[PDB]
Ligand binder design. Structure first.
Ligand SMILES: Nc1ncnc2c1ncn2[C@@H]1O[C@H](COP(=O)(O)OP(=O)(O)O)[C@@H](O)[C@H]1O
Ligand SMILES: O=S(=O)(O)C[C@H](O)CN1CCN(CCO)CC1
Ligand SMILES: OC[C@H]1O[C@H](O)[C@H](O)[C@@H](O)[C@@H]1O
Length: 477
């Protein structure tokens, strides 16, 4: 069974969110579980420089100009790179320019990604051909469309990591992407009078996967599907929609071996976590104090994440004696809101705006609680990292958060299953009740430790997840 993943990022070469973590870890797990998995990425500069053994496979002309298909390895997995400097050799984000505006040729940049994924099924590489093309998110959404147009020389799965990003382009671009004009149809890639790469992925794939069992249910609802729900309801009925939960990469997110930490620690030696908290407090300019709970955020700052609710709730949190440490980047309103809070409450609120990979580990390893009050959350990895690090997640019951965190209710505590704090509604009052629950648990240190050890006993394994994907691939044939 040979599978090609088609996507736009991969940890540690290029990362803007959880997708990169998935692509950095899933393929190696699949290989251990008996599927020959390879990855296809655009040759963005950070990616191209990471793959040092890359060699030329072939040159092709394309609706978007010439490519050199390269192939090399990273961490033992086979990586194909689409080297097309006129599209991909640009500094910064792969998705937008430095003024945060989408590149005007994005339609071509990402249409090409899907085209190469499909061409691989037809022998673009004379020595290797995938049985299944596994496309991820809108960026790779045309891969199943190009496959369909060619008579489906391989099977395809499309996985949604986030349905809010639709890959919308003006209809006239049908002229530019070398797909049959008949594809521009509601029974096709058309959506609200435009081309949607997301729609294309959802429509043309043999099978759709979402990144948690409950998100897969949620996206059949208007509230989470933003117009796509009719298609997804139909595919559900056809047995062509399922959920497979992400794992966590233990090479990188384990307090037991984490080299980025002041002090490594384990489920049975949580006293060794204390030094990380002390150093985190110092680093953030917070009062150094082990008697007080330190809440944390490591997050993109967009409305998805419900961090406006944290701002609303902050005074109540501080009033009860807590501290906040936030690391994040995104909406300037949020950035300034949090910067203003750090200014207003020095020694109680520490804030760092920007993307800092190493610092996220130091937060995860030192904080007592990780706040993930999401409006929607296809899976969420930060809460999984919190569980593994014994930093209790406080989450809204939605998407993967609902699948992975067990509230500290009476039953869950009595059954030995409690692992964090859960609230229901997207408002600050509902958040504040879960925050109070945390303060109550904090006042009972031995119960807190009991819950920490349960959180750290939870397992989210890529090789287990790989087993589910493998069943899917063989079923498709
Ligand atoms: N500002 C940041 N600095 C460092 N890492 C970040 C930052 N923001 C998010 N991350 C990391 O990016 C990943 C986010 O993944 P996830 O929780 O699935 O949410 P999303 O993909 O929606 O951003 C995690 O590895 C998280 O630690
Ligand atoms: O905003 S764009 O649609 O132009 C580009 C991407 O969709 C933005 N993202 C969302 C988060 N991603 C990785 C997080 O898992 C994919 C890049
Ligand atoms: O699948 C990896 C990640 O993809 C998306 O970015 C989602 O927002 C996040 O919930 C998920 O964990």
């Amino acid at each position: 069974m040979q599978v090609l993943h088609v996507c736009s990022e991969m940890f540690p070469l290029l990362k803007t969110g959880g997708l990169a973590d998935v692509i950095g870890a899933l393929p190696a797990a699949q290989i251990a579980d008996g599927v020959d998995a390879r990855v296809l990425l655009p040759a963005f500069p950070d990616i191209r420089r990471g793959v040092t053994d890359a060699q030329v496979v072939s040159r092709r002309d394309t609706f978007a100009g010439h490519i050199t298909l390269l192939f090399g390895h990273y961490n033992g997995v086979g990586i194909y790179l689409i080297d097309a400097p006129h599209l991909y050799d640009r500094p910064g984000s792969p998705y937008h320019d430095t003024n945060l505006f989408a590149y005007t040729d994005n339609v071509l940049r990402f249409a090409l990604l899907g085209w190469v994924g499909a061409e691989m099924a037809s022998g673009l590489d004379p020595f290797w051909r995938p049985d299944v093309v596994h496309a991820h998110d809108w960026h790779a959404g045309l891969a199943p469309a190009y496959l369909a147009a060619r008579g489906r020389p391989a099977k395809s799965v499309f996985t949604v990591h986030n349905l809010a990003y639709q890959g919308m382009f003006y209809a006239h671009h049908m002229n530019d992407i070398q797909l049959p004009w008949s594809f521009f149809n509601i029974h096709g890639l058309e959506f609200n009078g435009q081309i949607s790469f997301l729609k294309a992925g959802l429509y043309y794939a043999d099978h759709i996967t979402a990144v948690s069992p409950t998100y897969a249910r949620e996206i059949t609802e208007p509230q989470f599907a933003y117009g796509m729900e009719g298609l997804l309801q139909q595919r559900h009925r056809e047995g062509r929609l399922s959920g497979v939960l992400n794992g966590v990469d233990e090479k990188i997110w384990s307090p037991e071996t984490d080299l980025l930490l002041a002090s490594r620690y384990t489920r049975d030696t949580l006293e060794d976590k204390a030094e990380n908290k002390r150093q985190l407090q110092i680093a953030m300019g917070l009062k150094v104090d082990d008697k007080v709970p330190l809440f944390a955020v490591v997050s993109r700052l967009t409305s998805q994440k419900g961090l406006d609710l944290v701002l609303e709730a902050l005074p109540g949190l501080l009033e009860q004696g807590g501290q906040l440490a936030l690391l994040g980047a995104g909406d300037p309103v949020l950035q300034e809101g949090f910067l203003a809070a750090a200014a207003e409450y020095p020694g109680q609120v520490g804030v760092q705006i920007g993307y800092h990979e190493a610092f996220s580990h130091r937060i995860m390893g030192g904080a007592d609680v990780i706040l993930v009050p999401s409006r929607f959350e296809p899976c969420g990895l930060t809460q999984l990292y919190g569980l593994k690090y014994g930093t209790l997640p406080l989450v809204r019951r939605t998407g993967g958060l609902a699948d992975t965190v067990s509230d500290c209710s009476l039953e869950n505590l009595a059954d030995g299953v409690a692992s964090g704090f859960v609230f229901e509604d997207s408002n600050a009052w509902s958040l504040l009740r879960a925050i109070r629950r945390a303060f109550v648990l904090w006042s009972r240190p031995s119960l807190w430790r009991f819950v920490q050890r349960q959180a750290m006993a939870m397992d989210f394994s890529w090789q287990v997840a790989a087993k589910s994907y493998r069943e899917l691939y063989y079923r498709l044939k």
